[PDB]
Amino acid sequence: TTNKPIVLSTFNFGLHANVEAWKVLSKGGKALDAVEKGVRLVEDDPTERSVGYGGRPDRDGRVTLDACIMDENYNIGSVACMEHIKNPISVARAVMEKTPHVMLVGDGALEFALSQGFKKENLLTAESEKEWKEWLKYKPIVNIENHDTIGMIALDAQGNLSGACTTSGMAYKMHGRVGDSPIIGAGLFVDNEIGAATATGHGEEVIRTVGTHLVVELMNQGRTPQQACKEAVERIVKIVNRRGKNLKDIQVGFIALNKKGEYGAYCIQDGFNFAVHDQKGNRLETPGFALK
Amino acid sequence: TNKPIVLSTFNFGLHANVEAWKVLSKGGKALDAVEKGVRLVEDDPTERSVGYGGRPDRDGRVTLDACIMDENYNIGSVACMEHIKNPISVARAVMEKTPHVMLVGDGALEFALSQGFKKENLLTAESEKEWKEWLYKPIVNIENHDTIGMIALDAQGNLSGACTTSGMAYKMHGRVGDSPIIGAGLFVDNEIGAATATGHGEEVIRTVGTHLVVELMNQGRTPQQACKEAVERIVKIVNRRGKNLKDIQVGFIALNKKGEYGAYCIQDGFNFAVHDQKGNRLETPGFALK
Secondary structure (H helix, E strand, O other), rough: OOOOOOOEEOOHHHHHHHHHHHHHOOOOHHHHHHHHHHHHHHOOOOOOOOOOOOOOOOOOOOOOOOEEEEEOOOOOOEEEEOOOOOOOHHHHHHHHOOOOOOOOOOOHHHHHHOOOOOOOOOOOOHHHHHHHHHHOOOOOOOOOOOOEEEEEEOOOOOEEEEEEEEOOOOOOOOEEOOOOOEOOOOOOEEEEEEEEEEEEOOOHHHHOOHHHHHHHHHHHOOOHHHHHHHHHHHHHHHHHHHHHHHHOOEEEEEEEEOOOOOEHHHHHHHHOOEEEEEEEEEEEOOOOOOOO | OOOOEEEOOOHHHHHHHHHHHHOOOOOOOOHHHHHHHHHHHHOOOOOOOOOOOOOOOOOOOOOEEEEEEEOOEEEEEEEEEEEOOOOHHHHHHHHOOOOOOOEEEEHHHHHHHOOOOOOOOOOHHHHHHHHHOOOOOOOOOOOOOOOOEEEEEEEOOOEEEEEOOOOOOOOOOOOOOOOOEEOOOOEEEOOOOOEEEEOHHHHHHHHHHHHHHHHHHHHOHHHHHHHHHHHHHHHHHHHOOOOOOOOOEEEEEEOOOOOOOEEOOOOOOOOOEEEEOOOEEOOOEEEEEO
């Protein structure tokens, strides 16, 4: 029994993103195309205020985006702190496919996007501009309604894994701040002989623990996807305590999928959900949480 | 436990270790020792792949990458930063003074200047001449001391590490390698050990190299065994991607809680420096490409 094809993505907007990925997966399409099409739906929508277009700016009023992608054969691409391109996941795929590098940032990422035909656009909506000027008159508090990242991982009809992660980062972050979403091993990791995992939340904490590489290595060690996500969250809980911080101030979610299409998730604070679509249909599930 | 002890990469690790030992031999923190050690090399214009004499990207811009990690999971990083000679110290200020862990590009430079660092021209006349003559084949060259990574265990039994580079010569503007990425160029877990990487950064990111080395030591591997199996994982992936191993070089050095240390690389000719109470010496690790 292998449950394939199957796709998982983060937060409640993962349900709609999964319908676009299933359009690829249900026709035998590649997991890489499915996860790119899925997260682009959310990058494109200005009402999703933490991914792509309409994302809240850094404190200087610049919308800078972070994304990475990984396919079934350790090919990776990433862009971080890139301005004026609505679809960072697709520029990350072009870094992977068209350059000898795996990560470009800042002005160099934008110059490369324009060289590959991407269109320069104004990503700061009137809504985000209004909110930023009011904020100008930094408290990255936990908020369950803030779907701060879309991460999506899929196992296709060929039995191949791939994943994508994209965000506009912490609202009113310092100029040039980069979170976990464009870092391979922190926001996203895919090993086609084992499984894949993506992360959400306070990016600094996922980088600190190399979160998604740790989840996949625990599945390599025999942990179920859910057990792997749970123990990686418990490692963050331990480190939060050793650093003298308070867990109520921190939110991190992990979703994971292995080679047989088994899946799981776990988070620090209640209220993180994820969407799963497989042949039985698309549904929103609620994982366990550490802060009780 | 054999402590204090410090390891750093390549030939120039011997001189960098003498500066870190000035801190470690007096009971100083491993964090200050590894910062002082790699700054020696950032400061030297004759070291062409670290800080000040570093070879520019293809547009003639010297852009630097660095990260630091202490004994209690605190981390800081700057990538693709221009005009500041000492990126390891701006990384330490990201760690200590901001709510973030990584800043890049113009925002990293703006933060450095807000902290007192001075803007300097890092493109030496030598590097400028070489770049205009070059105006990309990132070959294996054992004379190219591409990164300095340094890891130390101090008198308190605490681990810390630093990694800094100017990255691949004539890289695309905006390219970031493994040296500022926690878990790829550098990782430190004070209950286990620490490891740093050198070489073709893209390959270390792909395998999340130094987090893998430390997790293998967590699983009971020796420092040398952990470095060897992480190199063997890169060998395997190079083969699955249909690539040729002769085109790639990666080195790992590692240190555990007990002060045991080890190293391994793909191609012969990588060396590292160890300084402990027996003195400072240059050792040569095993290599995969036989």
